[PDB]
Design a protein around this ligand. Structure first.
Ligand code: FPS
Ligand code: 1GP
Lengths: 226, 226
């Protein structure tokens, strides 16, 4: 696996229900990965059930860890978020230490990847939970980008949740990021918007839209790889 | 840049104290692999400066361990930016690094920087009060902090005990789990034999305050490790 060659990804939420016909269609759309997310309140049994539903298809299935209890074996990849702009140590390192203290063994039998998370949308569920200073200036965002690239993180995930983020903030971030792979998530609900950001981000993430209007989020893939 | 993986012994100097006579010189031509300018409480831009001009003339690498942004001085071969993995204050984990990237970005790109995973393991010292470190830890805690250090990609994991010698057994176990980063052990080393004993597991032993209390004896630690 190599994220430096991805262009598009779907982020599903084990918390919501998706008709299996649609789950099947996404896995076989041409996307580069299907990431199982879950901002919060995620249950182990929903992750497990999803993992078994997507394991058959060839696309790499990724687990985005957000709760120790939700760790489940069987995924091709494991992404460990590290919220860089959190005012709380638990979301940067703390929760990460409790996890290694508890599953340090199983955390050697998988390909794990650290993501430098930058939550730039101040009004979403994610920014409230992590006590993130999510209201940032272009120069704040770019500095976090820098940090991530200093700490050397395979990924810098610029996160804007349910809203489209500033295309300029994305263009610059990309400019400082020499080694990290920039992921952009936030408001991409169609081919038009997918194209705009894909031009600046290495990878664009499409989640919510999948639930809102499936038919049209499906076009984000062809829109950036067609 | 210089490769710390090839190092074994480093001397750590306090810019807020100066060595008598030709001592800085003997120390700089001793056989040490690097001379680190660090410092406690508050370091000053004036002290760092005076040190930097003094040590930069020798072939040995000189390093600035950036404890405070206000002491960021140009002229060093390397800058160690530490993240205190066990701190309760996000400032000490990433908050500083982002400040420096926001106020001194251009200076950053033109210097060779290295992130170091600090783990303050002595709950009774300046450093721990200063960083709000959850400094009371069993080998298990410490071992887990080192695995976070590696997930996070940090090239160095600094296990620090300050004024006291650390558990020889926490050193061997952390050395154990470290697959791809260098183990710096700092703490209470003031002689050849104690030096000899920690060099068995730590990749690098740091010798700090012992050069002020007993120069001639701190100096023997180099031979005792090579
Ligand atoms: C347990 C461990 C090793 C580390 C802790 C992991 C951390 C820091 C998790 C928080 C990451 C979050 C909430 C990301 C946004 S998910 P989303 O896009 O799904 O948000 P939404 O549900 O749509 O509101
Ligand atoms: O919520 P959206 O608008 O889909 O953005 C993707 C999101 O889930 C990234 O964390």
């Amino acid at each position: 696996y190599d994220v430096t060659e991805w262009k598009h990804v779907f982020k599903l939420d084990p918390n919501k229900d998706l008709p299996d016909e649609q789950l099947e269609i996404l896995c076989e759309s041409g996307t580069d990965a299907v990431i199982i997310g879950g901002s919060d309140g995620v249950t182990e049994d929903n992750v497990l059930r999803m993992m078994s539903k997507v394991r058959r298809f060839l696309v790499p299935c990724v687990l985005e860890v957000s709760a120790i209890e939700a760790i489940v074996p069987g995924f091709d990849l494991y992404f460990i978020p590290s919220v860089l702009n959190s005012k709380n140590a638990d979301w940067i390192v703390g929760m990460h230490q409790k996890a290694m203290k508890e599953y340090g063994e199983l955390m050697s039998m998988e390909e794990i990847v650290a993501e430098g998370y930058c939550i730039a949308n101040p009004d979403c569920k994610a920014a409230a939970l992590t006590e993130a200073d999510a209201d940032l200036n272009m120069d704040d965002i770019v500095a976090y980008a820098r940090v991530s690239e200093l700490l050397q993180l395979p990924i810098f995930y610029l996160e804007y949740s349910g809203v489209l983020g500033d295309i300029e903030a994305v263009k610059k971030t990309k400019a400082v990021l020499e080694t990290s792979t920039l992921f952009y998530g936030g408001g991409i609900k169609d081919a038009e918007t997918a194209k705009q950001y894909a031009e600046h981000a290495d990878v664009i993430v499409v989640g919510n839209a999948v639930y809102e209007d499936f038919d049209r989020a499906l076009k984000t893939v062809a829109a950036v790889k067609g």
